[PDB]
């Protein structure tokens, strides 16, 4: 019915990075050093005064050592604060039970994971093994069904309690496996680690994975942020319903934002919270990472998270009051570029490849996900109809969508699927449905949708919902001008096609609950890592498990109502996960792209590049860091390795020469 082609090549984007490509093992290694050091005030006021054990006793026998060769500016010096600005708000500290701490890097810094992938933008390959983090090493069995994983040994939580296999086991059994606990991010279901996957404790520093498939090496990426980042089991386990009288909601909410010094494996500990104002973190004296000179990380003593808006983060970063931003909203591009064009500018700004994409996602569950009413059920049936999807995508004037955000070479025609900025992308495999409003109108008439009351809006046939007007709800994230502008643009374009679309605008926390609970017809969403990188959270590319897909999940308790193209996509993704053949993997992503875009698994709105904004006083910021690839730039830049030269340091510490207090107690000690 439609004359499909490939999407047109966008304008050339001059100077992205450039990235200084390195080999995987140039960044870090685990080893003992001859001696260790720390800020002088810790030795004088805490160690010598009895208050803390000497540094060597606090560290693992073999800490994680950052290699000097990979440091952009070399070994650092202690001091200063990194000031972040966020549009989110904390719910509390229970990350593994699905509570947000405010986004914008806070949970990334607090909740460290088994592996780490964000700094891998500097390795020029897509078969890179994730960096060891809380898991120091691992080995595959000969048959590839068993993965023996060795943990960092001798590391402690920020309160001095030992980190070991008990924390790993508690997260796996009582958060992942437990169907009443869902970690933050919408992922981390048991099937995200493979169907029938088991994890068992061997000893205090050894765990063992058992996989149905042979060598599913892709799951090492799933073990990084956000899906395998354990909480302090000694604090959380006594609050869990399996070991107490608490309900699941009581367990989820047992650590509100007012609860101080929540134990972490991260470089800084939350010490202060003021509603709608600020979160202050102070250096963790038990941090288990050091530089090659034996200096215990982080270099920065303090981190701030100013509670504001996402657009204010850009404003503060270019003004110099904020130290970091991911410039990701096109309506802020011109003003940010103008302010950064001044040679006296306090911050540096650098655009990367086109990795920020937006999709229209349709709820594909016709078997009760989100318990829809008669109206909602009739929309699910239209969403599952391929002619309806072809009409919706063909009624979009993608050039006009791009123009509505920003002029210039930023936007690209985006039909959906894998981002054009990543190496697995193939233009020839991308099905583009050009703007054909007349063809879209004929396609809807062919499935029995026609305006029977002269109001310009299409009615269902008399057999469905008494022949009333089709009414579609659109779930939108209220925190971003981009999301809201795209939603408004979509409503106008659908009105021309004859479909009535109603915006349901919600704040982040409520938006995530409505989405993951399946309480939506359609939604507007910025793409997560699987479309920007393929290799990070690959399970999110298709409904490989009952809850791995963003738009097709099963209600509890029920199975998936997969359409044939979705089963073909699930098969491609599972084959990719267990393949170590580069040529086969590239071919599988071409087939994946083709099936996705031909069948309209989602409908692309637009795609463009973002820019990293960092205050100039910071040393060790890697060149060409993208804002979003394997993770957000807050992770990729390795904040625990950043430093400021003594003569350039700001004097912004709110708790200078202080360390975190005890969990559930007072302010910094
Ligand atoms: O956390 C660092 C990040 O914070 C801000 O974005 C947070 C954003 O996260 C969620 O949105 C996405 C995109 O749809 O969903 C995946 C998984 O949760 C995230 O990777 C991705 O951002 C929430 O659904 C949003 O409500 C929430 O605001 C900020 O925009 C980023 O630049 C970066 O600082
Ligand atoms: Ca284009
Ligand atoms: Ca390498
Ligand atoms: Ca090499
Ligand atoms: Ca000192
Ligand atoms: Ca001893
Ligand atoms: Ca080196
Ligand atoms: Ca050096
Ligand atoms: Ca200091
Ligand atoms: Ca400071
Ligand atoms: Ca931020
Ligand atoms: Ca074997
Ligand atoms: Ca040890
Ligand atoms: Ca000990
Ligand atoms: Ca845990
Ligand atoms: Ca679970
Ligand atoms: Ca198990
Ligand atoms: Ca098997
Ligand atoms: Ca313990
Ligand atoms: Ca109980
Ligand atoms: Ca309960
Ligand atoms: Ca409950
Ligand atoms: Ca709950
Ligand atoms: Ca309750
Ligand atoms: Ca709470
Ligand atoms: Ca914690
Ligand atoms: Ca607040
Ligand atoms: Ca207040
Ligand atoms: Ca106030
Ligand atoms: Ca030194
Ligand atoms: Ca505000
Ligand atoms: Ca915008
Ligand atoms: Ca520019
Ligand atoms: Ca994106
Ligand atoms: Ca169909
Ligand atoms: Ca344009
Ligand atoms: Ca233009
Ligand atoms: Ca465009
Ligand atoms: Ca291509
Ligand atoms: Ca009508
Ligand atoms: Ca009709
Ligand atoms: Ca538009
Ligand atoms: Ca199922
Ligand atoms: Ca299947
Ligand atoms: Ca590969
Ligand atoms: Ca510098
Ligand atoms: Ca560099
Ligand atoms: Ca300040
Ligand atoms: Ca407290």
DSSP states along 160-178: SPBPSHHHHHHHIIIIII-
355-610, what's its fold? Dipeptide-binding Protein; domain 3 (3.10.105)
- Cα 303 to Cα 346: distance, rounded to the nearest angstrom: 19
Nearest-5° Cα angle at 544, 542 to 548: 70
List, as one string, the DSSP characters of 560-593: ----HHHHHHHHHHHHHHT---HHHHHHHHHHHH
Which residue do the tokens 């034996």 mark?
294
Contact residues of ligand 1, CB 6 A cut-off = 88, 103-105, 108, 185-186, 310, 326, 328, 477, 479, 508, 512, 525-526, 528, 632, 634
The single-letter DSSP state of residue 487 is: H
In order of 136, 272, 506, 608, 626, the CA distances from 406 in angstroms are 45, 39, 25, 10, 20
- Cα 516 to Cα 24: distance, rounded to the nearest angstrom: 35
- Cα 346 to Cα 2: distance, rounded to the nearest angstrom: 51
Query: Which residue's C-alpha comes closest to atom 17 of ligand 1?
Result: 185
- Cα 340 to Cα 146: distance, rounded to the nearest angstrom: 51
Query: Which residue's C-alpha comes closest to atom 9 of ligand 1?
Result: 103
Which residue do the tokens 């031909």 mark?
598
C-alpha of residue 649 to centroid of ligand 47, in Å: 21
Mutation pick for ligand 1 pocket among 107, 632, 639 (CB with most ligand atoms within 8 Å): 632
Query: Which residue's C-alpha comes closest to atom 21 of ligand 1?
Result: 528
**Nearest-ligand number for the alpha carbon of 10:** 2
Q: In ligand 1, which atom is closest to the CA atom of 508? A: 26
500-506 and 115-116 strand pairing: unpaired
Q: Is the dihedral of CA 206, 211, 217, 221 positive or negative?
A: negative
Name the strand (E) or helix (H) holding 474.
Answer: strand 471-477
C-alpha of residue 20 to centroid of ligand 3, in Å: 13
Cis amide prior to 215 (ω within 30 degrees): no
- Cα 134 to Cα 336: distance, rounded to the nearest angstrom: 38
Name the strand (E) or helix (H) holding 393.
Answer: helix 386-394
What would the two tokens of residue 298 be?
A: 């982080």
Q: In ligand 1, which atom is closest to the CA atom of 526? A: 14
C-alpha of residue 654 to centroid of ligand 49, in Å: 18
What would the two tokens of residue 133 be?
A: 């983090």
C-alpha of residue 355 to centroid of ligand 34, in Å: 5
Can you give 397-439 as a three-state secondary structure string?
Answer: CHHHHHHHHCCCCCCECCCCCCCCCCCCCCHHHCCECCCCHHH
- Cα 322 to Cα 313: distance, rounded to the nearest angstrom: 7
Cis amide prior to 74 (ω within 30 degrees): no
Closest CA to 364 of 541, 521, 524, 598: 521
C-alpha of residue 24 to centroid of ligand 3, in Å: 4
Contacts of 78 (CB under 8 A, 6+ apart): 39, 295, 299, 301, 643
Query: Which residue's C-alpha comes closest to atom 20 of ligand 1?
Result: 528
Kindly give the residue spans of alpha helices, DSSP state H, lying in 190-332. Answer: 219-222, 233-236, 248-252, 310-319
**Nearest-ligand number for the alpha carbon of 99:** 25
- Cα 591 to Cα 271: distance, rounded to the nearest angstrom: 50
> Coil, strand or helix: which one is 353?
coil
- Cα 434 to Cα 1: distance, rounded to the nearest angstrom: 12
What would the two tokens of residue 119 be?
A: 């700094």
Closest CA to 300 of 15, 609, 655: 655
- Cα 475 to Cα 515: distance, rounded to the nearest angstrom: 8
Please tell me what resolution, in angstroms, this structure has: 2.0
- Cα 49 to Cα 33: distance, rounded to the nearest angstrom: 25
Instruction: State the number of CA atoms in the 13 A half-sphere of 446 facing the CB.
Output: 14
What would the two tokens of residue 590 be?
A: 């071409």
- Cα 347 to Cα 338: distance, rounded to the nearest angstrom: 12
Residues with CB under 5 A from ligand 34 (ion): 356-357, 527, 532
- Cα 121 to Cα 20: distance, rounded to the nearest angstrom: 10
**Nearest-ligand number for the alpha carbon of 59:** 13
List, as one string, the DSSP characters of 286-299: T--EEETT-BBSPS
C-alpha of residue 423 to centroid of ligand 23, in Å: 39
Query: Which residue's C-alpha comes closest to atom 7 of ligand 1?
Result: 103
Cis amide prior to 175 (ω within 30 degrees): no
Residue 609 burial by Cβ neighbours in a 10 Å radius (0-12, 13-18, 19+): buried
Total residues belonging to the chain = 669
Technique that determined the structure: X-ray
> Coil, strand or helix: which one is 206?
strand
Contacts of 470 (CB under 8 A, 6+ apart): 379, 382, 449, 457, 458, 459, 460, 499, 500
What would the two tokens of residue 343 be?
A: 């040679």
Burial string for 45-77 (b: 16+ CB within 10 Å, else e) reads bbbeeeebeebeebbbebbbbbeeebbeeebbe
Q: In ligand 1, which atom is closest to the CA atom of 185? A: 18
Q: In ligand 1, which atom is closest to the CA atom of 107? A: 1
List, as one string, the DSSP characters of 587-636: HHHHHHHHHHHHHTSSEEEEEE--EEEEETTEE-PPTT--SBSSSBHHHH
What would the two tokens of residue 77 be?
A: 């010096």
Cis amide prior to 53 (ω within 30 degrees): no
Closest CA to 223 of 118, 147, 114: 114
Mutation pick for ligand 1 pocket among 84, 103, 183, 481 (CB with most ligand atoms within 8 Å): 103
236: left (phi over 0), alpha (psi -120 to 50) or beta: alpha
Q: In whole angstroms, what separates CA 392 from the centre of its chain?
A: 28
Q: Are 267 and 638 in contact (CB under 8 A)?
A: no
**Nearest-ligand number for the alpha carbon of 563:** 35
Closest CA to 123 of 266, 233, 24: 24
Residue 126 burial by Cβ neighbours in a 10 Å radius (0-12, 13-18, 19+): middle
């Amino acid at each position: 019915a439609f004359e499909t082609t490939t999407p047109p090549e966008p304008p050339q984007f001059p100077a992205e990075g450039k990235i200084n490509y390195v080999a995987r093992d140039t960044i870090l290694e685990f080893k003992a050093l001859p001696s260790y050091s720390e800020p002088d005030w810790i030795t004088e006021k805490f160690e010598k005064a009895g208050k803390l054990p000497p540094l060597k006793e606090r560290l693992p026998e073999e800490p994680l050592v950052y290699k000097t060769g990979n440091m952009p500016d070399g070994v650092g010096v202690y001091g200063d604060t990194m000031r972040h600005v966020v549009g989110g708000r904390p719910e509390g500290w229970n990350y593994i039970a699905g509570q947000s701490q405010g986004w914008g890097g806070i949970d990334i810094a607090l909740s460290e994971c088994l592996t780490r992938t964000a700094p891998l933008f500097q390795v020029d390959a897509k078969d890179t093994e994730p960096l060891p983090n809380l898991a120091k090493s691992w080995e595959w069995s000969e048959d590839g069904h068993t993965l023996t994983m060795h943990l960092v040994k001798g590391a402690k939580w920020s309160d001095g309690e030992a980190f070991n296999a008990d924390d790993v086991m508690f997260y796996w059994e009582d958060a992942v496996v437990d169907p009443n606990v869902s970690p933050l991010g919408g992922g981390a279901s048991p099937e995200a680690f493979g169907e029938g996957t088991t994890l068992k404790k061997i000893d205090d520093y050894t765990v063992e994975w058992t996989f149905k498939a042979a060598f599913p090496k892709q799951y090492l990426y799933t073990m990084a942020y956000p899906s395998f980042c354990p909480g302090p089991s000694h604090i959380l386990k006594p609050q869990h319903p399996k070991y107490s009288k608490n309900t699941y909601n009581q367990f989820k909410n047992a650590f509100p934002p007012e609860y101080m010094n929540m134990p972490v494996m991260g470089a800084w500990v939350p010490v202060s919270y003021r509603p709608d104002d600020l979160i202050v973190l102070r250096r963790n004296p038990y941090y288990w990472k050091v530089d090659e000179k034996g200096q215990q990380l982080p270099y920065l003593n303090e981190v701030h998270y100013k509670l504001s808006t996402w657009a204010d983060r850009d404003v503060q970063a270019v003004a110099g009051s904020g130290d970091f931003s991911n410039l990701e909203q096109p309506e802020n591009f011109v003003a940010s570029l103008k302010r950064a064009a001044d040679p006296n500018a306090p911050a540096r700004l650098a655009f990367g490849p086109r990795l920020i994409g937006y999709n229209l996602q349709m709820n594909f569950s016709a078997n009760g996900w989100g318990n829809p009413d008669e109206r909602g059920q009739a929309i699910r049936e239209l969403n599952r109809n391929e002619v309806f999807r072809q009409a919706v995508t063909s009624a979009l004037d993608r050039k006009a969508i791009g123009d509505s955000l920003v002029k210039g070479p930023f936007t690209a025609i985006y039909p959906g699927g894998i981002s054009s900025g990543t190496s697995f992308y193939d233009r020839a495999s991308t099905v583009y449905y050009p703007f054909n409003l007349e063809g879209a109108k004929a396609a809807l008439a062919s499935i029995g949708l026609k305006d029977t009351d002269g109001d310009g809006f299409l009615n269902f046939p008399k057999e469905t919902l008494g022949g009333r007007n089709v009414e579609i709800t659109l779930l939108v994230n209220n925190g971003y001008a981009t999301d809201k502008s795209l939603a408004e643009g979509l409503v106008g374009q659908m009105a021309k096609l004859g479909l009535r679309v109603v915006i349901h605008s919600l704040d982040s926390n409520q938006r995530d609950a409505a989405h993951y609970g399946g309480q939506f017809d359609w939604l507007v969403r910025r793409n997560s890592t699987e479309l920007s990188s393929v290799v990070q959270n690959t399970e999110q590319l298709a409904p490989v498990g009952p809850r791995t897909s963003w738009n097709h999940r099963s209600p509890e308790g029920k199975e998936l109502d997969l359409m044939p193209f979705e089963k073909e996509m699930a098969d491609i993704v599972r084959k990719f996960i267990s393949s170590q053949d580069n040529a086969e993997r590239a071919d599988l992503m071409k087939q994946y792209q083709k099936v996705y875009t031909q069948n309209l698994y989602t409908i692309g709105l637009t795609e463009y590049p973002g820019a990293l904004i960092v205050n100039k006083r910071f040393s060790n910021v890697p060149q060409g860091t993208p804002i979003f690839m394997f993770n957000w730039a807050e992770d990729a830049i390795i904040r625990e390795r950043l430093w400021v030269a003594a003569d350039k340091q700001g004097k912004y510490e709110l708790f200078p020469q202080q360390l975190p207090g005890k969990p559930g107690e007072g302010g910094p000690i």
